[PDB]
Every structure is written in C-alpha cells, then in structure tokens.
C-alpha cells in the first residue's frame, strides 16, 4: 500500500550531541559530534474502527 511505500521516502531524521566524549585529544576529538538518533518510521497501519472502555 501507498502508506508503507511512502514512509521509506522520508526515511531518516538525524541529530547529534553538543556534548563531547573527551576522547583522545586529536582532530578525531574535533571530528566527533556525539551519538546519533536516526529516528525513522518503517510501518504505518490503519485499524478498522473499534471501541474502548
């Protein structure tokens, strides 16, 4: 279906930290942003209408 086929065209949303690891004091210390979300959605499903109580 078009919904599950559509959630993989808008795939990933990534950020990083402002915090450092305090690693080896190198250019790898400058080349380190932190750790990274890659929050994504790989499935969307519509449920037939029910009732909750």
């Amino acid at each position: 279906g078009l919904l599950n086929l559509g959630v993989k065209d808008i795939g990933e949303k990534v950020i990083f930290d402002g915090k450092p690891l305090n690693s080896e004091d190198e250019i790898s210390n400058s080349g380190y942003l932190g750790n990274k979300l890659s929050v994504s959605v790989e499935q969307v499903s519509i449920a037939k209408p029910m009732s909750n109580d």
Binding site: Q43, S45, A47, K48
Partner: protein, 330 residues
C-alpha cells in the same frame, strides 16, 4: 495444595517481605563497597532486575554474547563473617516493631532455613476458606477424568467474589472435553480475549501481587496465552467441520506487530485453504489463479514470521508441503 486464586493480604506476610527485602539491600550495598576495594526497600530491589513477562523465568540462552568468565574467587568463612554482621547490626531498630515470630522468621531466613507455613493455611476467612476447598476438588476431578462434577465445581467457584483469571481459562477443558450439551469451549475463549485484552505497557515498577504476567495477562510485547489459544483451537476446530475465511479475515484485523507465532498461524490459515481448494474434483478459469494467491500468502506470511523474533518453523518441510500443493496446480 494447589494454587488458589486469592488476593489474600496479611500484615504478617507483608512486614516479613518488608523486613527481608530491607536486609537484602544493605547486604548487597555492602557487597558493592567490598568488591570495589578488593523509599520502600522492595521497589528499590527490583530496579536491578528485568521481569520476563513472556515466561515464568527469564531464560538466557547460552550460544550468544552472554558468555562469562569464571570467578574462581570462592567464598570462605572469613569473607562470609563480616559481610553479614554490619547489615545485621544495622537492621536492629525495626526488629522490635515486628512481631515475635517475624524476628524469629528473620533470623531463620538470615541463615537459610526456607519456611514451611504457606500463606494458604492460616487465613481463617470462611470466604477464602471455601475457595481453597473448591480449587483443590476442581483440580482433582479434572485430574480424575470426571467432567460433570468438575463442571459443577467450576460453575460454583467463579461465582464467589474474590476469584481471579487463574481458574477461569486454564481448566476450560471442561467444555472442550464435555462435547455433549456443550457451549463448545471456544465461546469462552472469545469471552476471555474480548474483556481482558489490553494493550498497556508493562510498567514493571509496581510490585505485582495476585496477577502475574506469563499466563493470565495480555500486554504489549506479550500476546496473551489465552489469545493465542483461541487462535489455534479455532483453526483446528475450523478444519474439523470438514469458515476458514471467517477467521482469515479475523486474524487480519489485529496487527500483532511484535510476535512471530501469530504470523505462522496467519500463514497456516491459507495453508489449509491451499490444501482444501487444491482438489478441484474434475476427474478451469478462476480456481487456478485463486490458489496462486494462497500459495503466495503462505510464502510472504512465513517470511514475516522469520522477520520477527525467535520462533523457528520447519520452513524446509513447508516448501515440501507447498510444492506438493503445486503438483495439482501445474
């Protein structure tokens, strides 16, 4: 003898769990400050752990990255002697607020000595007392292959206020093994998965008494034992009327998008169609390219059974089953 579905609560069993789990914590926080140099007191203790909620026991399989080195640092008397004194000397002030048998219970369970008086004995309530009488004869007559009498015990047991999910769905073979003037047994499993089925998250921080996950509740990431029972027993019954479309539509409506066992049975619905329809009784336009869906539904729903977590299937044998279905397709 048997397990009784009671939320029985006494302060004596509630203080002695409030007494023991206090003593576990000081002697484990003692073991923290020796191994490095070498508030409820129960809600604090379970934050170390992860309750299984699919099983009674968290089974950790061995052939993985759960290997471990042996600590050859054995325990002698001189390590066991002072790691237990100062938590016993720090326990001394609430041990007079407790009863005269709780302090005696405590120093018993300070040195091993697992107890012998079970909570089902000394309740003396007259309402739980007829529960414990009716639960045992319920489990006895089902064990003794007696069904008209167990159906009378179980109709009386569920009408007493205080009973639980425990007795309800497990020994509902009494409708399944009656089959004389029956309500077919599967209408009761439909009663179970219509009122108890909730998709709440297992919150794990509250201390669960009298409701236990692995065999009576149905949270997220844990399909209920009675929900998947109503799946298999309504597919075996669905064969034995020879309605498959009535359940193949019905399984389609929940997206149980975590567990793999409901995807095998959702493949197994179409596998019974591709075995029943592939007869054709000739000795030819739509019946050939309808089964070509039912082969393709078994193949894609078996792959998503493999896509989810651990539930292995004989997918080498099923393709020997499915190709034998193809031999009459051609």
């Amino acid at each position: 003898m048997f397990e009784v579905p009671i939320t029985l609560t006494n302060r004596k069993f509630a203080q002695r769990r409030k007494l023991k789990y206090q003593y576990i914590n000081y002697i484990s926080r003692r073991f923290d400050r020796i191994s490095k140099k070498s508030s409820d007191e129960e809600r604090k203790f379970w934050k170390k752990y992860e309750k299984p909620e699919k099983s009674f026991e968290i089974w950790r399989t061995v052939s993985s990255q759960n290997k471990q080195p042996i600590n050859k640092q054995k325990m002698t008397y001189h390590n066991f002697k002072k790691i237990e004194k100062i938590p016993l000397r720090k326990m001394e002030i609430p041990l007079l607020h407790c009863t005269k048998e709780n302090k005696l219970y405590f120093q018993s369970i300070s040195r091993g000595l697992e107890p012998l008086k079970t909570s089902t004995s000394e309740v003396r309530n007259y309402r739980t007392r007829h529960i414990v009488t009716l639960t045992d004869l319920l489990h006895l007559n089902v064990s003794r292959h007696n069904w008209s009498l167990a159906y009378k015990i179980f109709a009386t047991l569920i009408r007493i206020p205080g009973v639980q999910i425990k007795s309800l769905w497990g020994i509902g073979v009494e409708i399944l093994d009656n089959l004389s003037n029956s309500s077919s047994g599967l209408d009761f499993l439909q009663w179970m998965c219509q009122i108890y089925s909730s998709k709440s998250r297992f919150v794990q921080n509250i201390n669960y008494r009298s409701i236990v996950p692995p065999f009576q509740t149905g949270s997220r990431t844990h399909t209920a034992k009675f929900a998947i029972t109503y799946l298999w027993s309504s597919l075996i019954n669905c064969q034995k009327s020879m309605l498959i479309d009535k359940i193949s539509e019905w399984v389609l409506t929940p997206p149980f998008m975590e567990d793999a066992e409901v995807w095998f049975i959702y493949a197994s619905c179409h596998l019974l169609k591709a075995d029943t329809l592939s007869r054709q009784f000739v000795n030819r336009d739509i019946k050939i390219n309808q089964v070509i869906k039912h082969i393709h539904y078994v193949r894609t729903f078996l792959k998503i059974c493999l896509d989810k977590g651990g539930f292995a299937v004989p997918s080498r044998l099923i393709e020997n089953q499915l190709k034998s279905f193809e031999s009459r397709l051609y």
